[PDB]
Design an enzyme around this catalytic site. Structure first.
Site, PDB file in Angstrom:
ATOM      1  N   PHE A 118       0.248   4.314   7.400  1.00 33.60           N
ATOM      2  CA  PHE A 118       1.223   4.088   6.380  1.00 33.60           C
ATOM      3  C   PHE A 118       1.566   5.437   5.751  1.00 33.60           C
ATOM      4  O   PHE A 118       0.898   6.155   5.126  1.00 33.60           O
ATOM      5  CB  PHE A 118       0.782   3.076   5.337  1.00 33.60           C
ATOM      6  CG  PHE A 118       2.150   2.783   4.466  1.00 33.60           C
ATOM      7  CD1 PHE A 118       3.051   1.822   4.890  1.00 33.60           C
ATOM      8  CD2 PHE A 118       2.179   3.259   3.223  1.00 33.60           C
ATOM      9  CE1 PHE A 118       4.171   1.543   4.128  1.00 33.60           C
ATOM     10  CE2 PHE A 118       3.221   2.901   2.406  1.00 33.60           C
ATOM     11  CZ  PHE A 118       4.268   2.038   2.896  1.00 33.60           C
ATOM     12  N   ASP A 203      -1.722  13.294   5.037  1.00 31.51           N
ATOM     13  CA  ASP A 203      -1.301  12.477   3.906  1.00 31.51           C
ATOM     14  C   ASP A 203      -2.521  11.883   2.889  1.00 31.51           C
ATOM     15  O   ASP A 203      -3.164  11.099   3.276  1.00 31.51           O
ATOM     16  CB  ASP A 203      -0.626  11.105   4.699  1.00 31.51           C
ATOM     17  CG  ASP A 203      -0.075  10.152   3.534  1.00 31.51           C
ATOM     18  OD1 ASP A 203      -0.250  10.359   2.379  1.00 31.51           O
ATOM     19  OD2 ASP A 203       0.814   9.331   4.139  1.00 31.51           O
ATOM     20  N   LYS A 232       1.162   8.908  -6.291  1.00 34.06           N
ATOM     21  CA  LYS A 232       0.131   7.814  -6.726  1.00 34.06           C
ATOM     22  C   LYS A 232      -0.502   8.453  -8.077  1.00 34.06           C
ATOM     23  O   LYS A 232      -0.102   8.679  -9.207  1.00 34.06           O
ATOM     24  CB  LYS A 232      -0.748   7.186  -5.866  1.00 34.06           C
ATOM     25  CG  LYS A 232       0.165   6.309  -4.628  1.00 34.06           C
ATOM     26  CD  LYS A 232      -0.921   5.639  -3.854  1.00 34.06           C
ATOM     27  CE  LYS A 232      -0.240   4.695  -3.013  1.00 34.06           C
ATOM     28  NZ  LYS A 232       0.399   3.442  -3.566  1.00 34.06           N
TER      29      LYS A 232
HETATM   30  C1  LIG Z   1      -0.931   6.975   2.512  1.00 31.47           C
HETATM   31  C2  LIG Z   1       0.437   6.713   2.069  1.00 31.47           C
HETATM   32  N1  LIG Z   1       1.281   7.658   2.122  1.00 31.47           N
HETATM   33  C3  LIG Z   1       2.743   7.195   1.564  1.00 31.47           C
HETATM   34  C4  LIG Z   1       2.798   6.351   0.546  1.00 31.47           C
HETATM   35  C5  LIG Z   1       4.366   6.113   0.162  1.00 31.47           C
HETATM   36  O1  LIG Z   1       4.219   6.531  -1.427  1.00 31.47           O
HETATM   37  P1  LIG Z   1       5.097   5.915  -2.497  1.00 31.47           P
HETATM   38  O2  LIG Z   1       6.325   6.197  -1.721  1.00 31.47           O
HETATM   39  O3  LIG Z   1       4.801   6.689  -3.536  1.00 31.47           O
HETATM   40  O4  LIG Z   1       4.840   4.485  -2.418  1.00 31.47           O
HETATM   41  C6  LIG Z   1       1.926   5.343   0.637  1.00 31.47           C
HETATM   42  C7  LIG Z   1       2.269   4.310  -0.537  1.00 31.47           C
HETATM   43  N2  LIG Z   1       1.578   3.066  -0.427  1.00 31.47           N
HETATM   44  O5  LIG Z   1       1.959   2.126  -1.317  1.00 31.47           O
HETATM   45  C8  LIG Z   1       1.505   0.685  -1.310  1.00 31.47           C
HETATM   46  C9  LIG Z   1       2.156  -0.069  -0.064  1.00 31.47           C
HETATM   47  C10 LIG Z   1       3.680   0.228  -0.336  1.00 31.47           C
HETATM   48  N3  LIG Z   1       3.451  -0.246  -1.829  1.00 31.47           N
HETATM   49  C11 LIG Z   1       4.937  -0.303   0.554  1.00 31.47           C
HETATM   50  O6  LIG Z   1       4.889  -0.896   1.433  1.00 31.47           O
HETATM   51  O7  LIG Z   1       5.907   0.160  -0.108  1.00 31.47           O
HETATM   52  C12 LIG Z   1       0.578   5.557   1.089  1.00 31.47           C
HETATM   53  O8  LIG Z   1      -0.590   4.532   0.880  1.00 31.47           O
END
Ligand SMILES: Cc1ncc(COP(=O)(O)O)c(/C=N/OCC[C@H](N)C(=O)O)c1O
Ligand SMILES: Cc1ncc(COP(=O)(O)O)c(/C=N/OCC[C@H](N)C(=O)O)c1O
Ligand SMILES: O=[N+]([O-])c1cc([N+](=O)[O-])c(O)c([N+](=O)[O-])c1
Ligand code: NA
Ligand code: NA
Lengths: 378, 383
Positions: A118, A203, A232
Site C-alpha cells: 500500500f 515507504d 503519519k
Molecule cells: C505504507 C503507506 N504508504 C503510504 C500511505 C498513504 O499515506 P497518506 O496519504 O498519508 O494516507 C499509507 C497510508 N495508509 O493509510 C491507511 C489506509 C488508507 N487509510 C487508505 O486506504 O486510504 C501507508 O500505510
C-alpha cells in the site's frame, strides 16, 4: 464505525455519548504520541500565533529546523516536505523516474513493487500499490510497474534489468497483513539496486518515525535506501510528510524544500520526543506488554496462528476457523470500548501511541479479551 | 524558471496582510502564499478555532467521521450544488479524487472504455503524476516515465476544439473556470456553458477545478455561481483552510454512489475551514471583495498611466492579472523581485503576467501602501 469520537487525551477517546475508549489504533498509526499531547498542543498554539503558511517559493524556520533534525538523524542530505504519505510517495516515485531519465536513459522506467503493498490512493501510487482491486476501474494506469511477491528475492532478481529505475518497498507491509521483510530480502534489494543502477525506495509512511522501536525501520535492518518517505507519525495527527534523499539524487529536480510552517513546528516537537533513547526503549517494553496479553488471549480462546510485526506495529493473524472475520473482532472490540485495526480480513492490527501508558495497555487488552470472549461464545 | 526566495528572505511572522522576514523587514502581502491565506495571517477567528479544536481532538482516520467534518460538509452542501463531500489535504489530492471519480463513474455506469479526459493547454491541476498529466504544461509532465493515458489537451476558451475531440468514449471535461497559473484567463460565458452542454450530450462529467478560484476568490463563493453553470464535480482547497492544508471534492449523490453525506476530513483542519467558511460566506465579505478589487485595479491603472507597462488588467474578484506589454515580455519575475525589494509580495502567472491574490479582507490602508510600494518597484525596473 458506529460512534463519533469527539475528544481524546493520550490513549483514551470519548464519543458523543461520553463513552470512554482505549485507543490501540492511533487513527491507523498516525497519533504516535496520543491525542492532544501537551508538547504538540504547545507547538501548535505557539506557531499558530506566529505564521501558519508559506508557499514553496519560501522556506520557513520550522521547516528548516525539521529538515536539519531529519538530516542529522538519518542517511538523508535533502528533505522535501508535503502533506500526506501519498504526496510524499508521488514525489519519491517521480524523483526515481526522473533521476533515471536524466542520469541514465529515458527508457529506464521499470518500477518493481510488491503484491499487497500500500502506497496511497492517487492513481500513480495506487498503481505502485499491490492490490489490483484498489487500482482497477480508473482508466489507463501509469505503465511500467511490475509486481512480485513480498519477500521473494528471486522474483525481484528475475524481473530487474538495466531498464529498471526503482524498487519500491515497505520494510514492513502494514496494510498487507503486518508482514516484515526478512534480512536477506531487504539486503538483497539493496544489492540488486546497486547492480542495476536503480534506486531503492523505502515507504516508511507507516513503519517510520519510531513505530518499530528505531527511528526508521531501515535502521533496524541496517540497509540504507536511496529515497525514504515518512508521514503519519511524523506530525502526530497534523497532516505532514517528508521525502528524504541524498544531494546527488535530489539534484535531478538548499537542504529543504516545502513544508507548512505550522505542520513543521508540530512535527519538530513530535520528532524531539520520539527520537529519544527512553521513548525508543519504551516502545520495546510496551510491545512485550501487548504481546503477553495477546498470548494470554490465545491461550484462553485459541484464535491466533501468529503474532508478528515490529515495535508497536503488531499483527495477530486469526486461525483458519476465524479466517475472514477480522472485522467481527474489530466491531466487538469497539462495543467493548477498545479501538483496534485490521490488516486484511485475516489479521488484527495494533498501532497505539508510542507512549501509551502501561495502565492503558492492560485496560484495553482486558477489554479486547472481553470482546474476543463474546465472539467465541457465539 | 521558477520563483524562489534567496536565503535572506525567510518569512518568520505574519499578521493580517503584513509579513516580516528574519531581518525584521516588513512586507505587504498581495500574494497570499499563492491564493491560500484568504483571510490573511493569524486571523483571530482562525487562530481561535485552531486552538480550541487543538485542545480537543486533532485526528480521526477515514473510518470515522468527526464533528468539525460533519459541520463543514453541511455548510458546503447547503451553500452549493453539492450533495456529497469528500475531504482531503491538498488541491492535488482533491483533483486526484475528482478525476478518479469521473473515470470510475464512467466505467461502472457506461463502459470500461469510456475513458477520455479533455483538459486545456496551460491548465494547472497539481503535481502528482495523474494531475500534472491532466495539467496542460508538457514541460511539467515530461520526464517521469509513462503518463496515465487518454488525456487530450485543447486550447482554453476554444469550444470548437472541445466539440471536435469529444465523443461517447469521453468521461470528463476538466477545467479551471479561471486559469490562475495560465495567465489569469477567465472562461468566456459561451465556452463554459458550451462545456456543460457538450458534457450533457456525451454523458461526460464536467469537473471544475476551483482550488484557486473558489472559496470567495471571485467575489462569489465559487466561480461557477458567477457563471451560472453547474458542474458535476468541483474541487476546492487553498482558501478553504486559510493556511491550514485542507481540500474538498464536491459532487452529487448519483455520482458519489459510484465510489452519511461527508467522508474524510481532519478534525483540526475542518474546524479551521469551518471558521474560514463562516467569514467568507457572508454578503459583506463577498461585497468587499468587489470593492477591494476596484481599489487594486485603480492603482494598477495609475501605475500604467505613469509607466506604460500593462496591456490588460483581468481576472475576477481578488484574483487579478496584469499582462505586461510586449516591451516587457518575460519580465514578470523581475517585477516580482523588485516588488519584494520595495516591501510588497506579488505573484506571476507565467513570464508575461503579474498576479495578485491578497487576503479577501485586506485592509484599504494595506492596498494603498502595498500598491505605492509596487509603483516604486516598477519605477526602478523601467528607469
Ligand atoms: C505504507 C503507506 N504508504 C503510504 C500511505 C498513504 O499515506 P497518506 O496519504 O498519508 O494516507 C499509507 C497510508 N495508509 O493509510 C491507511 C489506509 C488508507 N487509510 C487508505 O486506504 O486510504 C501507508 O500505510
Ligand atoms: C487550479 C489549481 N488546481 C490544483 C492546484 C494544486 O493544489 P495544492 O495541491 O493544494 O497545491 C493548484 C495549486 N497551485 O499552487 C501553485 C503551485 C504549487 N507551489 C505547486 O507547484 O504545486 C491550482 O492552482
Ligand atoms: O531554475 N533554477 O535552476 C534555479 C536555481 C536556483 N538556485 O538557488 O540555485 C534558484 O534560486 C532559482 N530561482 O530563483 O527560482 C532557480
Ligand atoms: Na544525514
Ligand atoms: Na446542495
Amino acid at each position: 464505525a458506529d460512534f463519533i469520537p469527539v475528544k481524546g487525551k493520550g490513549s483514551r477517546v470519548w464519543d458523543q455519548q461520553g463513552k470512554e475508549y482505549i485507543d490501540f489504533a492511533g487513527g491507523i498509526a498516525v497519533t504516535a504520541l496520543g491525542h492532544c499531547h501537551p508538547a504538540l498542543v504547545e507547538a501548535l498554539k505557539s506557531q499558530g500565533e506566529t505564521l501558519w503558511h508559506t508557499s514553496n517559493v519560501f522556506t520557513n524556520e520550522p521547516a528548516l529546523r525539521l529538515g536539519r533534525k531529519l538530516i542529522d538523524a538519518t542517511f538523508a542530505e535533502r528533505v522535501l516536505f508535503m502533506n500526506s504519505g501519498t504526496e510524499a510517495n508521488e514525489t519519491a516515485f517521480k524523483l526515481a523516474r526522473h533521476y533515471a531519465c536524466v542520469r541514465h536513459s529515458p527508457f529506464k522506467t521499470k518500477i518493481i513493487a510488491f503484491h499487497n503493498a500500500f502506497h496511497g490512493r492517487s492513481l500513480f501510487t495506487v498503481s505502485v500499490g499491490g492490490q489490483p482491486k484498489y487500482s482497477d476501474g480508473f482508466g489507463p494506469k501509469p505503465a511500467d510497474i511490475i509486481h512480485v511477491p513480498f519477500n521473494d528475492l528471486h522474483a525481484v532478481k528475475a524481473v530487474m534489468d538495466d531498464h529498471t529505475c526503482a524498487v519500491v518497498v515497505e520494510p514492513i507491509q502494514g496494510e498487507g497483513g503486518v508482514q516484515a521483510a526478512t534480512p536477506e530480502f531487504l539486503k538483497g534489494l539493496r544489492d540488486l539496486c546497486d547492480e542495476h543502477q536503480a534506486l531503492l525506495v523505502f515507504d516508511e509512511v507507516q513503519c517510520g518515525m519510531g513505530r518499530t522501536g528505531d527511528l526508521f525501520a531501515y535502521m533496524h535492518y541496517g540497509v540504507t535506501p536511496d529515497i525514504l518517505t515518512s508521514a503519519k507519525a511524523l506530525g502526530g495527527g497534523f497532516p505532514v510528510s517528508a521525502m528524504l534523499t541524498t544531494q546527488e539524487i535530489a539534484s535531478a529536480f538548499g537542504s529543504t524544500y516545502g513544508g507548512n510552517p505550522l505542520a513543521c513546528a508540530v512535527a519538530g516537537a513530535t520528532f524531539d520526543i520520539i527520537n529519544t533513547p527512553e521513548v525508543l526503549q519504551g516502545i520495546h517494553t510496551k510491545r512485550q506488554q501487548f504481546v503477553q496479553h495477546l498470548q494470554a488471549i490465545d491461550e484462553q480462546f485459541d484464535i491466533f496462528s501468529d503474532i508478528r510485526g515490529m515495535g508497536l506495529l503488531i499483527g495477530a493473524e486469526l486461525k483458519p476457523k476465524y479466517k475472514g472475520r477480522a472485522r467481527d473482532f474489530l466491531y466487538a472490540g469497539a462495543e467493548a470500548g477498545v479501538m483496534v485495526l485490521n490488516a486484511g480480513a485475516d489479521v488484527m492490527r495494533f498501532a497505539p501511541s508510542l507512549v501509551v501508558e502501561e495502565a492503558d495497555i492492560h485496560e484495553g487488552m482486558q477489554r479486547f479479551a472481553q470482546a474476543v470472549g463474546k465472539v467465541v461464545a457465539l
